[PDB]
């Protein structure tokens, strides 16, 4: 968007002052939408010397004569030209500016407008900026942040030593990565994205996206009336072990609940019988194993089972030992079908295999699994969308990096999912999503499309749970999938 | 407001381009508020070469990429600098402009945005501008006018040969006289007044006002609990004749229904008995007249009746003959109380008397009565607020010039009333308003305040009638006054 503002001024010829005026009035309107009538409130506007501060002076000026009181505290040592222009207007209109933040000043105001730093912040916040931000956060006032809460790195969502906790953030043109990834997402509060007059073509030239309800609705496959089960695809799920007998069942029902026609599971005997006792609509093939885990002796049978399906999911509950590792890698190297690779299949995966496959794959790691896959620390991979993009491009796959905000990428397009809640931070949730992705691929969506629709619907289903989210289990999530689909439509 | 825009740019330093951008975005938001989601509509924007047209280019540009279709027809031979600037932006953003209005083009659009002429129009519209405006008015499309419907004289509300009939008019800063007086008021449709960033001090330096609910609520007098009838004033109404026996009754009840403490009527016997048969709370004093009309022989009695009141109303139903003329003028010259002068008292009034009175007066003519009073034609006085102001200043009075839009002025402040409906175009309505004004003066409001509150409440009462307005009568209006007061509070 730094690019976007510059082209809009330099190539399109929109005066920088017009963009700044539109930015500020949009904050005023946003506030009115959340607070109702503004005339009873007293506003403290905290302005930096940059263009975020300039936007703050526009806000402040537009409140003059209309609200109970407005004061600007200017916290800068110099002003960008647009900030200087809007400072001068604020003062010409009769506005009061002070240059020293006295901690008790907070007592006399209802709303704090945070226009200290925007996307221009670089480096840790120190000194008196930090003391001020901390005082605002302890004040209990309503906080409205201009563009991004001050102290959030707009490219990453990390806190730069400290940051404002906003009730309402008003950003311009498009959301920033820092609104979408945590901790930034938490500090943003309610986000409104304001149209401030950039050409719609430039706004739409962005290559990273938030997954929206309208996007998912347009990707949901068609259900032709004259269909039969094969119309809706066939999935094989290779999953489970004597240790982990539940995973197959959750993956399988995840495929069925999204509309897949036929789902079969290959599960070590007698753990395969667990699935049909719970959901007799599943096909749960018994696999004769030596000690309760898949091994190379099961390679040929699993390849034969794969011949008559559209997609294969592998990994949930397989276990991780050397014999599973041999099986997984040899299977994936030979399988000429799309694969969804999760859990223990990721843990044992040789990435060389991904490079040599002709068929597509989707990988669904959490950050612990991603860290192991690229031999890095969890902190180095968590919310690292550039790493994810590089990995997907280098390995010719779709990568679905699960977290509260889920990143989906094929290395060219990257999508961020914000549906869900903490009830999904519980064993079994990932197994459901794996089945969902395979099911949608089986119905004819591309690996990327299937991943996009699935992460959104999985999170939206969680949110439809009727009692406290901490009590949500994967079994209940399964029941909520068709409701999420209905509500989406 | 020509003044207002210039000071805002030249003294306050707001770039003219910023004001024009704010004007245009305000039209977009106004449209969304009335049409809902704009994305399904096709917009035809008609732009002149002036700043109204410039505002139109801002509207058009802001719709690009967001609605079904936008086309501008540019109808000018040259462009003001701001219009030229916004034309260039419109084109840079990919907007289509044609310079010839083909009559069938209307078929392909849902909404016409009228940005041809604003407050800059001078003189009759001829030629192809007129043909275009007439085609828009025959088209049945939704019409949104920028600032004022093109063809209305913004200072007077007259049609300059022809004018656009708008469904929605969006004006900037303040309403214009042309929105408020007819025929302009009719052609405006629904009016929204947008804040486009003028300093609130300049907006409030205007000396003419629309009478609003908030103004009337703040002027309504207090009702202290420990009161008695005298707290709320005493009114004498000198009214009626053998020809016109109903007028006194309507005036008297008009005073009582607005909260006046005591109302007495002086009416020629036996017509005085009509009043108490209908409303026995009135005092209706019998006056012994020679032939059924007040004359000089009743002067002394009426002066004695005036000693114990706060205000005297005179005129409704008196009749107009030489003996009434002698009485009225001698009475008013001698009466040292505020007077409300209506109807036949206006018809016989010698304005020299107004100049020589020490006490205040309010006059309540309709345009026929005003025309007779200043010896002009009805067309010369109707909606002539400058004449009204001159008359009030020269005669030291408040003038209430009744019409669908009522003008109230003391020569320094002028207020326009827009409440009411056509049920008030019926005999008896004016007699009620006279009593209302006297009553409010008796309660302690200034002549100007009393006139302001009364015209608003009188019109608002009419609008509360539950059946078709053409069936409203003065008797029913009386019943609705206390409801208007309640609703106002």
């Amino acid at each position: 968007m730094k690019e976007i503002d510059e082209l809009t001024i330099k190539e399109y010829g929109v005066d920088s002052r017009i963009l700044m005026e539109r930015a500020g009035i949009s904050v005023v309107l946003a506030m009115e939408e959340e607070l109702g009538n503004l005339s009873d409130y007293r506003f403290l506007v905290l302005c930096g010397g940059g263009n975020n501060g300039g936007d703050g002076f526009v806000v402040a000026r537009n409140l003059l004569g209309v609200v109970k009181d407005v004061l600007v505290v200017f916290l800068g040592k110099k002003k960008t030209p647009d900030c200087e222009y809007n400072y001068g207007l604020y003062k010409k209109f009769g506005g009061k500016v002070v240059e020293q933040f006295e901690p008790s000043i907070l007592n006399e105001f209802d709303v704090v407008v945070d226009a200290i730093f925007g996307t221009g912040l670089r480096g840790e916040i120190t000194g008196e900026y930090a003391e001020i931000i901390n005082l605002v956060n302890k004040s209990g006032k309503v906080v409205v942040s201009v563009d991004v809460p001050s102290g959030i790195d707009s490219n990453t969502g990390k806190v730069l030593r400290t940051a404002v906790k906003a009730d309402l953030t008003v950003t311009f043109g498009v959301p920033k990565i820092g609104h979408i990834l945590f901790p930034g997402r938490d500090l943003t509060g309610k986000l409104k994205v304001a149209n401030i007059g950039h050409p719609v073509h430039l706004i739409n030239s962005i290559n990273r996206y938030v997954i929206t309800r309208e996007m998912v609705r347009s990707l949901l496959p068609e259900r032709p009336r004259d269909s039969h089960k094969g119309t809706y695809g066939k999935v094989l799920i290779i999953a489970g072990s004597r240790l982990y007998s539940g995973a197959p069942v959750l993956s399988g029902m995840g495929s069925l609940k999204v509309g897949t026609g036929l789902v079969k599971l290959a599960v070590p005997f007698p753990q395969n019988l667990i699935a049909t006792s719970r959901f007799p609509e599943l096909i749960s093939v018994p696999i004769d194993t030596e000690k309760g885990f898949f091994s190379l002796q099961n390679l040929q049978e699993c390849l034969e089972l794969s011949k008559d399906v559209d997609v294969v999911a592998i990994g949930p509950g397989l276990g991780n030992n050397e014999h599973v590792r041999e099986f997984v890698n040899e299977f994936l190297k030979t399988l000429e079908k799309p694969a969804v690779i999760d859990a223990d299949a990721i843990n044992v995966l040789d990435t060389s295999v991904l490079k040599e496959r002709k068929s597509p794959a989707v990988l669904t790691p959490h950050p612990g699994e991603m860290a192991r896959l690229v031999k890095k620390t969890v902190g180095d991979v968590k919310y690292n969308y550039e790493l994810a993009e590089e990995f997907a491009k280098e390995n010719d796959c779709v990568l679905v990096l699960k977290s509260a905000t889920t990143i989906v990428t094929d290395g060219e397009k990257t999508l961020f999912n914000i549906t869900g809640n903490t009830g999904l931070s519980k064993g079994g949730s990932g197994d459901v999503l794996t089945g969902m992705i395979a099911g949608f691929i089986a119905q004819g969506l591309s690996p990327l499309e299937a991943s996009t629709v699935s992460v959104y619907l999985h999170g939206f289903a969680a949110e439809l749970f009727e009692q406290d989210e901490r009590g949500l289990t994967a079994s209940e999530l399964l029941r909520l999938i068709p409701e999420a689909i209905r509500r989406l439509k | 407001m020509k003044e207002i825009d210039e000071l805002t740019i030249k003294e306050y330093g707001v770039d003219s381009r910023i004001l024009m951008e704010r004007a245009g975005i305000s039209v977009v938001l106004a449209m969304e508020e009335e049409l809902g989601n704009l994305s399904d509509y096709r917009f035809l924007v008609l732009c002149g070469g002036g700043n109204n047209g410039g505002d139109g280019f801002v509207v058009a540009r802001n719709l690009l990429g967001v609605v079904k279709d936008v086309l501008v027809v540019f109808l000018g031979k040259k462009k003001t600098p701001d219009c030229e600037y916004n034309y260039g932006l419109y084109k840079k953003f990919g907007g289509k402009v044609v310079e010839q209005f083909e009559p069938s083009i209307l078929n392909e659009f849902d909404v016409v945005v009228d940005a041809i002429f604003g407050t800059g129009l001078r003189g009759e519209i001829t030629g192809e501008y007129a043909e275009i405006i007439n085609l828009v008015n025959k088209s049945g499309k939704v019409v949104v006018s920028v600032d004022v419907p093109s063809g209305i004289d913004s200072n007077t509300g007259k049609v300059l040969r022809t004018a656009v009939k708008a469904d929605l008019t969006v004006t900037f800063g303040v309403p214009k006289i042309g929105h408020i007086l007819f025929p302009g008021r009719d052609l405006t449709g629904k009016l929204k007044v947008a804040n486009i960033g003028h300093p609130v001090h300049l907006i409030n330096s205007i000396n003419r006002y629309v009478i609003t609910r908030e103004m009337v609520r703040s002027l309504l007098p207090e009702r202290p609990r420990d009161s008695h009838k005298g707290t709320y004033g005493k009114v004498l109404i000198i009214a009626g004749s053998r020809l016109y026996s109903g007028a006194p009754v309507l005036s008297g009840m008009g005073s009582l229904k607005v909260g006046t403490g005591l109302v007495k009527l002086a009416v020629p016997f036996p017509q005085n008995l009509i009043a108490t048969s209908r409303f026995p709370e009135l005092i209706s004093v019998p006056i012994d007249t020679e032939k059924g009309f007040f004359s000089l022989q009743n002067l002394q009695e009426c002066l004695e009746l005036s000693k114990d009141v706060d205000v005297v109303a005179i005129g409704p139903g008196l009749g107009n003959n030489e003996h009434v003329r002698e009485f009225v003028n001698e009475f008013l010259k001698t009466l040292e109380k505020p007077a409300v002068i209506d109807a036949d008292a206006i018809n016989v009034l010698d304005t020299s008397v107004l100049k020589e009175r020490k006490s205040p007066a309010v006059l309540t003519p309709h345009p026929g009565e005003m025309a007779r009073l200043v010896k002009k034609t009805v067309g010369d006085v109707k909606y002539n607020y400058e004449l009204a102001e001159e008359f009030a200043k020269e005669n030291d009075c408040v003038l209430v010039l009744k019409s669908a839009t009522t003008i109230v002025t003391d020569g320094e402040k002028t207020l326009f009333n827009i409440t009411g409906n056509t049920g008030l175009s019926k005999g008896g309505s004016g007699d009620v308003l006279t009593g209302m004004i006297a009553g409010f003066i008796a309660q302690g409001l200034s002549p100007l305040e009393a006139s302001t509150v009364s015209v608003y409440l009188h019109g608002f009462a009419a609008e509360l009638f539950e059946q078709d307005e053409r069936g409203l009568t003065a008797s029913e209006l009386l019943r609705l006054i206390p409801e208007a007061i309640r609703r106002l509070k």
Partner: peptide
């Protein structure tokens, strides 16, 4: 939605 995506 002309002004805001929420």
């Amino acid at each position: 939605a002309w002004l805001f995506e929420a």
